[PDB]
Design a protein around this ligand. Structure first.
Ligand SMILES: CCCCCCCC/C=C/CCCCCCCC(=O)OC[C@H](COP(=O)(O)OP(=O)(O)OC[C@H]1O[C@@H](n2ccc(N)nc2=O)[C@H](O)[C@@H]1O)OC(=O)CCCCCCC/C=C/CCCCCCCC
Ligand SMILES: CCCCCCCC/C=C/CCCCCCCC(=O)OC[C@H](COP(=O)(O)OP(=O)(O)OC[C@H]1O[C@@H](n2ccc(N)nc2=O)[C@H](O)[C@@H]1O)OC(=O)CCCCCCC/C=C/CCCCCCCC
Ligand SMILES: CCCCCCCC/C=C/CCCCCCCC(=O)OC[C@H](O)CO
Ligand SMILES: CCCCCCCC/C=C/CCCCCCCC(=O)OC[C@H](O)CO
Ligand SMILES: CCCCCCCC/C=C/CCCCCCCC(=O)OC[C@H](O)CO
Ligand SMILES: CCCCCCCC/C=C\CCCCCCCC(=O)OC[C@H](O)CO
Ligand SMILES: CCCCCCCC/C=C\CCCCCCCC(=O)OC[C@H](O)CO
Ligand SMILES: CCCCCCCC/C=C\CCCCCCCC(=O)OC[C@H](O)CO
Ligand SMILES: [Ca+2]
Ligand SMILES: [Ca+2]
Ligand SMILES: [Cl-]
Ligand SMILES: [Cl-]
Ligand SMILES: [Cl-]
Ligand SMILES: [Cl-]
Ligand SMILES: [Mg+2]
Ligand SMILES: [Mg+2]
Ligand code: NA
Ligand code: NA
Lengths: 200, 202
């Protein structure tokens, strides 16, 4: 008897792949698997709305996967690959800002985002932890990226299919070892949110 | 810039504390911080009802803290301290069964618990990881607990002061290195559900 098998759907199958990849990045110390987790997290919602398998269980499961993949894993990667007392303070602040902004997203039903979304925060931190070899610098970004995440800066979701693929190609290049394009499209998407907010 | 400061209550800070210790358990590779997490997870609720700060922003943050403290960390503490191709396969199944039953707990407003609760499943795996020094036994227990956590075995929630006090007393003993009493309680509480699932229906 496992009645939980009744509410599991095809979209939840992709979400569990997103959980596995996020937890595997923690266990295997892989920055690359975080890039695979962004591909999954940007797809399972599209997969849900395509097969009609949208559910509150899948929505809750969608954010549980964000916790593992884009909240704990990037904080772990930052500390495990930059062992310091500065980085430990920053990994905590980064993870707490992820939990807080995911608790806000859980009670909201808006098209866009309130504050920088947690996948864009992970891609920034992880991509910065892959290109910069600095305990001090990467710790300041994590705190900066964290404060962006619990802010009121509105960000657009526009999950139109071409936008996902364009984002995903850079993630495919990021997985194989060139995150410069994944990081370029993220820093542009980040400051774009700033300007549209400061402009009004 | 931070309208999140308006919706954060005093009980949320106890949840913020449970996130810090659960994450410090992963980073510092600490079995003891999981036991301190189970105490925090028992009180952030209690504070919320006691101080009337029950909120959907706090219920969300409550589930988020369970993933870090009792989903990822027991899986990490298992694989890290028992590195093998198999503690990897079991820690994945454990953390996956935790996410499935936490996503079900979110859609359900039932009085008790459907399946073994994730703090109890974590304590069982964590307490066993401290007592049994075997890649094999701890990997199987993760399977059995994981299957228990996604099962339909109804587990009761009786969060009164006296009950929370007894469990937290043993958890303090687990914090300082004697987890045999929180382990014995969690074994009794786990099998108690299997008996009541078997003995009666309604
Ligand atoms: C020329 C044009 C070039 C294209 C521009 C490229 C766009 C973006 C590049 C980099 C962007 C950084 C990352 C964006 C933030 C992010 O992570 O999105 C989260 C987003 C996923 O977040 P999400 O909240 O989980 O959405 P989603 O998974 O689809 O929906 C979840 C819901 O689906 C249901 N669901 C989900 C899973 C499940 N198992 N069951 C369910 O029922 C539940 O109701 C869930 O609540 O990933 C994306 O889709 C990326 C889209 C691309 C960003 C859109 C920006 C459009 C362009 C703006 C102009 C920018 C200027 C140029 C920028 C370059
Ligand atoms: C002698 C010893 C034997 C008995 C003496 C006491 C021992 C009890 C056994 C405990 C050991 C089992 C492990 C604990 C189980 C567990 O995981 O629950 C955690 C459980 C955590 O559950 P939880 O999901 O976090 O709920 P809770 O913390 O109360 O709050 C959640 C809600 O509060 C609100 N909230 C929460 C946080 C926040 N920041 N804002 C909010 O608004 C949201 O609505 C949230 O959804 O807390 C406990 O530790 C309960 C302790 C007592 C367990 C039940 C004891 C009954 C035992 C029966 C055995 C047979 C007796 C009679 C037989 C006839
Ligand atoms: C309001 C704030 C409340 C916050 C309350 C939570 C307190 C956080 C405790 C952290 C202890 C961390 C233990 C430090 C372990 C450091 C291990 C280490 O590696 O440091 C050595 C260095 O990296 C070699 O160069
Ligand atoms: C309540 C939560 C806040 C945290 C409360 C604790 C405050 C931390 C104080 C540290 C100073 C202790 C004196 C040691 C000086 C720092 C040592 C150091 O900076 O590095 C270590 C050295 O490099 C070898 O690893
Ligand atoms: C229903 C069947 C499922 C449940 C069956 C599993 C329960 C069996 C008990 C296991 C713990 C016994 C541990 C025996 C050894 C403990 C003493 C010891 O060596 O501890 C090491 C030391 O504490 C290092 O810190
Ligand atoms: C898994 C992707 C599935 C899609 C297939 C696409 C091809 C790319 C495959 C593997 C990329 C390499 C993975 C990198 C694994 C490295 C593990 C690690 O330990 O990371 C070291 C890092 O440098 C910390 O310092
Ligand atoms: C469009 C005409 C009007 C604007 C004209 C201005 C030129 C803008 C274009 C590029 C600027 C360079 C931006 C940074 C590009 C870095 C690309 C790179 O170096 O990637 C190498 C790869 O990562 C190996 O590992
Ligand atoms: C049904 C679940 C499948 C698993 C079966 C559960 C029942 C096994 C009970 C105890 C095993 C303890 C024996 C294995 C460990 C030796 C005892 C021990 O931990 O000693 C400490 C170690 O030698 C130094 O740290
Ligand atoms: Ca998603
Ligand atoms: Ca709680
Ligand atoms: Cl949001
Ligand atoms: Cl988010
Ligand atoms: Cl439940
Ligand atoms: Cl639970
Ligand atoms: Mg997700
Ligand atoms: Mg919790
Ligand atoms: Na779904
Ligand atoms: Na609250």
């Amino acid at each position: 008897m496992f009645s939980i098998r009744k509410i599991i759907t095809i979209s939840d199958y992709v979400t569990m792949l997103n959980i596995i990849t996020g937890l595997l990045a923690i266990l295997l110390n892989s920055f690359s698997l975080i890039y695979l987790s962004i591909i999954f997290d940007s797809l399972d919602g599209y997969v849900a709305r395509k097969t009609g398998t949208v559910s509150d269980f899948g929505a809750e499961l969608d954010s549980i996967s964000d916790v593992v993949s884009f909240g704990v894993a990037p904080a772990y990667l930052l500390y495990n690959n930059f062992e310091s007392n500065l980085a430990l303070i920053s990994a905590i602040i980064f993870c707490l800002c992820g939990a807080l902004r995911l608790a806000r997203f859980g009670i909201l039903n808006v098209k866009g985002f309130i504050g920088l979304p947690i996948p864009a925060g992970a891609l920034l931190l992880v991509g910065f932890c892959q290109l910069i070899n600095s305990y001090l610098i990467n710790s300041i970004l994590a705190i900066l990226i964290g404060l962006l995440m619990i802010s009121d800066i509105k960000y657009p979701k526009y999950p139109n299919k071409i936008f996902i693929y364009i984002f995903a190609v850079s993630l495919c290049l990021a997985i194989v070892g060139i995150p410069h394009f994944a990081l370029m499209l993220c820093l542009i998407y980040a400051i774009y949110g700033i300007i549209k907010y400061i402009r009004g």
